[PDB]
Each structure stands twice: as structure tokens, then as C-alpha cells.
Amino acid sequence: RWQVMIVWQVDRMRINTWKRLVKHHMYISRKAKDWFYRHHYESTNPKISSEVHIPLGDAKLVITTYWGLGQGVSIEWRKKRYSTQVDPDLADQLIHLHYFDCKQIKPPLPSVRKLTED
Amino acid sequence: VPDQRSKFENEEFFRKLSRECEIKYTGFRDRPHEERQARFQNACRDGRSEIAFVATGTNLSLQFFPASWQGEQRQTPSREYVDLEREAGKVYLKAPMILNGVCVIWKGWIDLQRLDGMGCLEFDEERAQQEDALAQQAFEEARRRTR
Amino acid sequence: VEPMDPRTFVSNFNNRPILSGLDTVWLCCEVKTKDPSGPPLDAKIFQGKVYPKAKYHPEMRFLRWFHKWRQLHHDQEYKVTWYVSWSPCTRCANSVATFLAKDPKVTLTIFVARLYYFWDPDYQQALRILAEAGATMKIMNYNEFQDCWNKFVDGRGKPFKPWNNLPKHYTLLQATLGELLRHLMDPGTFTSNFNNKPWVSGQHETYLCYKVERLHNDTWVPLNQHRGFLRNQAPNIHGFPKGRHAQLCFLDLIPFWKLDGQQYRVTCFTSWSPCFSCAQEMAKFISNNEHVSLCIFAARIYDDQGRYQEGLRTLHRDGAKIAMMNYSEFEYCWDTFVDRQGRPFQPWDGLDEHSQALSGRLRAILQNQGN
RNA sequence: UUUUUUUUUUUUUUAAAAAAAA
RNA sequence: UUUUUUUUAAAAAAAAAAAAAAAAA
Ligand SMILES: [Zn+2]
Ligand SMILES: [Zn+2]
């Protein structure tokens, strides 16, 4: 089959800032203590750099990060085997209005529209 | 379906996504073109490759993945297809995707010699009730609240 | 020579494949003529930023310094040596390879401590382009580290003390450079050792050809990024390196890929049979790792009164699929892991006779357990 | 370069015990 | 009331030693 995924195309620099900020917020700070970072090897897909899983209640946002395409992003929304693609504005809204609080800090907060700067 | 169609005429990204965009294939650009067309024919005829379709705004790209890569054989998304026998000299792409609160089928055509083509979106009312879980109400409640 | 950071080079040039918390890519080059017996002309150590910037990388430092040197020096053939802490970067590799293709005189030898980003294709293709440009890239051993400490480290007379787990990481990194750079064994060593005419002269050192599949929901599909020949290391070349017998590096390199819970099999085209000091580790390894099955094709059965029968029995009983090398498997080993350059596979005298004789020996030794 | 641990001490706090002195 | 010894746990840095670093943890 030809299972369909949307992809936001972005260079290695912005994707590496995205990875740096998300692991800095899970591990160095305690803002994202409930977030998951599924590694590249746990993904059986050959074109996945990472799977940042953001548990939103009983649901879970998925930010899959890709390889060898530059690189690509894809945002899902999974709750009991039900997927839903999500544009970066809605993913930003769900992240900021479920997890974090409300200005520039030396680590900027993980925002998928700053990822998809273009 | 009615409020789904009302918000379907309300999304800001949908104005760009369903304006019959000029889709192009961004694959192996530095190589010859003829071999790009030939590789498009092999990729649309094989079972292990990906194909990417990019709009004019160089930000959004639909990518088709083989179902064995994820290792999940789901029966209900089976309507996605790459048609060549339907019409001569033109390849059709069909993909049912659940975008935000709505389930929309992406339909496009792309010439084998132009490698470019037309893409658009279309509501299909079957997937509104075929989703057994139907967490669109929960999605709605999550997306409307604001701190 | 101006020597920079005496002490930080111990855990900054650290032979360990995965090592985070770093900011500096180091580069410790030296320039020479075509004759290496002569003294070096100059040897300057450079320090380029890692993720900081691509324009101010150590490779760009070297590119700029070579430019400023060669406008003030005579143009001739140069044999430059590097010792870099990481592997080159995508942009750096794709510019350094252009710089090597621009001047045929300059010949690099990029020695790396750790490989930078070996698990994504965007870096792997860049490293393959750099290696195809004409720079022989080798993982640093003890001797290159001793050269780096002797030249480019402000030592106070103290000698180079190798850290713990240097040679295990050396073979763990060499067998993925050999798989990421499509390194293929020569035809000469293949027709020297892999042929199954019986041991009367030569053929002292065993070889390997591993191959990884996936067992997907449809069928088996091979991965192409885990394939190479993992020859067993020389036994204690100066005492400190561990001399690993029975392609120990394969079993030790098993977990290095971070194998998924997805079950599959790994093919091991060994040019011998796993000995008693190498098969019990295999049986334990296939015991505690249920997901990975390990199929084995052997050229010649190891028989030196080493009680190999019990090890082979407990290797087969746990779930390893041992067979013996026929012309199909020999053809695959010549087709995939040997740089045949287009030449077809040539057989020897008594291919099927020796194959069926050794397989009958395998039947008479393996299958007689419990009658 | 940094997190998680094991085993030993230097000085302090607290508690218990043995001995000597006023 | 003062002095010597042993022990139960902690604290500032140190040397003895290990594991995870999938890469600005
Ligand atoms: Zn670099
Ligand atoms: Zn052995």
C-alpha cells in the first residue's frame, strides 16, 4: 500500500535546535517530565529520526521527525488507535494550553511553528 | 457532517490546501530528468519506495509510505492508491487523510513527462461514521479551550 | 608545534562510539611530501566548533590554512594526515571532498576517534562521498593515538596511557566504518581462506560475512545498512588490545545497533566453525535474546579435539540455524561482500564433493545426539 | 565534559559503650 | 566537668571503581 503522511520540510539546523530544546526540556529541566522521546532505533520505519510523544491527558500528540527526504516533520494525534494529522498552529495551541505557561529565554520553548519557520 | 462542513469552510490552511495547487516531485534533482521520469515509473510500480509531492509554497509535502515500513496492516485505510491504468499518460494519486477535525480525500494528477500536476482536496462523508472510536468531540474540546 | 589541551584529550579523543556533552571538534593535522621518511614541514592543531557553525568548522580552518599556505608556498604533491575527534560533517564533508577533487596533489588520511552520526543516511551519504573522493578514512588505533600524544599533546615526559575499553570500542567502530563505507574484502583473501579445500598450508585467520534481515509482516526484507565482513582481530598485537576469537565482535556488536523488539535473523558466513571458546557465548546470547535468531554458514568445520561437538549441539538446540556453505552461499559471498569489480564468481575443484562431504560430517557430528 | 551507583578516609554534628583524671 | 578509643548516619572537595550517554541529557 501507499500509506499517506504529511511532511513539513525543514533543514538540519532547525531540526537540530528542535531536538536540542525538547531533550533539554525533558532532561535538564523539569518542565517536560511526562514527555516521551521514542528513539530512532525503536522506530521500525527507516525514515524516522525521532518520535516526540506528548501525552495530552488520555490522548497523545506525536511529533515524528524524519530522515533523508532535507528533513521532515509530521504531527499526529493518537488516542486508542485513532490518528489525526494536526497543523503546527493547532499543535502549538494544544501544547501551550495543555502543558506549559505563558519574552525570549536562552532556551526557547518547543514550538512547532518556530520549527516550521520556512 | 453539517458543522464539519461549516468548519471545513472555516480553516485557514484549507484555503491553501484545496486551491488546486501546482504539485511537483522533488526527488533526485541533480540527476538527469528522463531518469527522474523513469524512477517515477519504477517507484509507482514497485512496493518499497516513497513519493513526495510539494506545493508551490515549498513548506508542505505529502509523502506516501509503504504499509510494511510501519509494520501495521490496517484494513480501513485501503482507499489510497496510485492509478496508472485509469487513464493513459497521466498518474492519479488518491489518499484519505484525517486532517484536524475532518476526514478529507486528497486527489491529484501528475504528468509523467511534466512531473508536475494539479492537486486538490475533497470531503467524503463515509469516513465521518466509519471511525468507530470517533474522538472528534474530544479533539474539538481540546482545540477550543484557552488558558 | 604548539600543543593545546594536555589533559582534555583523554576523554575528548575518547574511543567510545556514543559520547554526548561535547562542544569541540578537534583536528590535529600534519603536512608532508610524498616521502614520509623526511621531517614534516609543519603540523598545526585546529579547533573547530561542533553544532556552533558550519562555516567555522575545523575542516574550514584546514581549508583556509591550506589556502593561505599554498599561495605562499610551492605547489607540489602533499600527503596530509588528520586526527579528528569526530567524523566530518555533512556540509564539511561535501566541501572537503570538493576540495580534494579540486587539487589532486593533496592526499588526506582522515583518522577519526568516534564516528559522527553514523545512523542517519544524510551523514552516511556525505561520508561515502568524502571517502570516494580519495581520502582513506580509518578508525584510530593505539599507534595513531600514541602518535597524537607524542606530537600534539603537551606531555611532561609521561607516556600515553590508554583508557579502559579502548580496543572493544575500536572494533565496535571499525566494523561500522566497514559497513558504512561499503568496504569489501579483496578477491585474494577470499580465494585464500574462504575456499573449503582442507587445511594443509596457510589460512591461519578466520573471517566473517554478516547480513541482517527484518522478518516483516509480509516476508523477510534485508537491511542494506548492516552488511560487512568482520574479520577476527589479531591476538594481542601489543598485549593491550584484546584478541577476539570466533568473531566475538559480532556477538558484542549485536546489541550495538540497538536491535528492535521486532524479531529477525542474522546471517554469519563464517570461514570456520565456532569453537568451544566461542560457541557457548553464542548459545547464551541466543538464549537471553529471544527475538534475534542467528543462522550460520560455515566453510570448514573446526576440529582440533577441542570438544566442539557439545558446543555445536548446544548451539543448534537453542535455535541457531547452522548450515554449510554451498555454491549458492559462496556465490552470494562473492556477489555482495567482495569487490568483484564486475568479475564473475569462479569455483574450485570439487565444490559439490567437498560441500557434501563436509555437510555429511555435519550430519554425522550434529544429528547423532540422543540417536 | 555531565547524570546514576558501589567501596575507604580526612573535619564537624548527634547517640551509645570501654578506660583515665579533677 | 575534662581527656583517649570503637561504632550508627549525614554533610564541603578529593583520590579507588563501574553503568547510561543515539549526540549541544
Ligand atoms: Zn565538521
Ligand atoms: Zn576461537
Residue numbers in the entry:
A (entry chain B): 4 to 72, 82 to 114, 158 to 173
B (entry chain C): 5 to 151
C (entry chain A): 9 to 142, 147 to 383
From the reporting publication:
Human APOBEC3G (A3G) is a virus restriction factor that inhibits HIV-1 replication and triggers lethal hypermutation on viral reverse transcripts. A3G contains two cytidine deaminase (CD) domains with complementary roles in HIV restriction, the N-terminal noncatalytic CD1, and the C-terminal catalytic CD2 domains.
While full-length hA3G and other primate A3Gs are prone to aggregation, we have previously shown that an engineered A3G from rhesus macaque (rA3G) has improved solubility and stability. Our assay confirmed that K128D single substitution in rA3G rendered the protein highly sensitive to HIV-1 Vif–mediated degradation in a proteasome-dependent manner, while D128K in hA3G rendered the protein highly resistant. The cryo-EM map exhibited a density representing a double-stranded RNA of up to 22 base pairs protruding from the A3G-Vif boundary perpendicularly to the Vif-CD1-CD2 plane. A long protruding A-form RNA duplex is branched above the cavity formed between A3G-CD1 and Vif. Among the four nucleotides, the R+1 base plays a pivotal role in the complex assembly anchoring Vif, A3G-CD1, and A3G-CD2. Direct protein-protein interaction was observed between the A3G-CD1 loop7-α4 patch containing -128DPD130- motif and Vif. There is no observed contact between Vif and RNA strand A. Vif H43 and Y44 play dual roles in RNA and A3G recognition, facilitating its unique three-way interaction. In the structure in complex with Vif E3-ligase, rA3G CD2 undergoes a rotation of nearly 180° around CD1 compared to the apo structures, resulting in the two domains facing opposite directions.
